[PDB]
Design a protein around this ligand. Structure first.
Ligand code: DAO
Ligand code: DAO
Ligand code: CL
Ligand code: CL
Lengths: 155, 155
């Protein structure tokens, strides 16, 4: 869709803790319920020495907040990773300063998130998020407060 | 919250057909499911000679798309109406050109909609909607395509 990627991305520097501060998707049903397919809350990024990205996340599964670990395998493009699915899906990093915020989208139909390092509404990062979204066909946008950010599955 | 109201509002001129093109709310759960409390789709406005506003809407009730009629009673302020509830709730008209778009919010916790006259994504009206929202503490925003606009309960 989806032509904002980060130049010069250093994947090692996105390691560590993240909070899904805001989420957006092209279909309401991708994000509408707690158990909706793309309602996933990022907990931690672990880039591997190969330069694959391991993702720890929470997803509300059947009546509970399950912890999931997913591998995004690297591509020829440093800002684009691949997740193995049914068929499968690209993760693109649009923008990050490493230390405060990271924007990314998953496509294939589309969902994007604004990730932040701390449980804080980051006005700057949310501006960047909305700007990157105005380019995209989004029909639902969610945002979470600092209290929900400290809760499992933002409950 | 909620300090954008329309000056010189002529309530007779909002009569007729409307489409809820976009919705936003301060709590995700006010809009998340089809049966969520403020997921209501405006069908028609009928101002009465007294200057009360009769509202025809659809709401997804128990497994189906119910038609509801609600009366918003006028106040001293032309752009502000009152709905009788458990306790009760103000409707404010923020902005309208009568002929294309109308923005309104309901408060008491808060939901706003961008209404349009035709089943068309109105880029102008959506700009106005987002501008009026940046002032407000919104955590979910929904938008509907022209196909869903022609469907009962936007299904
Ligand atoms: C910088 C990469 C950000 C992490 C991308 C998250 C991808 C999650 C894909 C969701 C699939 C699933 O959980 O079933
Ligand atoms: C210009 C006025 C726009 C109409 C305002 C809609 C108010 C709907 C309130 C929802 C309450 C309910 O349906 O139970
Ligand atoms: Cl939908
Ligand atoms: Cl919530």
């Amino acid at each position: 869709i989806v032509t904002q990627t980060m130049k010069g991305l250093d994947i090692q520097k996105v390691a560590g803790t993240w909070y899904s501060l805001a989420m957006a998707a092209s279909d309401i049903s991708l994000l509408d319920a707690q158990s909706a397919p793309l309602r996933v809350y990022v907990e931690e990024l672990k880039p591997t020495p190969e330069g694959d990205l391991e993702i720890l996340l929470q997803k509300w599964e059947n009546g509970e907040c399950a912890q999931k670990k997913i591998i995004a395998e690297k591509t020829k493009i440093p800002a684009v990773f691949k997740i193995d699915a049914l068929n499968e899906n690209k993760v693109l990093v649009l923008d990050t300063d490493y230390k405060k915020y990271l924007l990314f989208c998953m496509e294939n139909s589309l969902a994007c998130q604004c990730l932040v390092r701390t449980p804080e509404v980051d006005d700057e990062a949310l501006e960047k998020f909305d700007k990157a979204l105005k380019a995209l066909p989004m029909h639902i946008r969610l945002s979470f407060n600092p209290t929900q950010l400290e809760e499992q599955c933002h409950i």
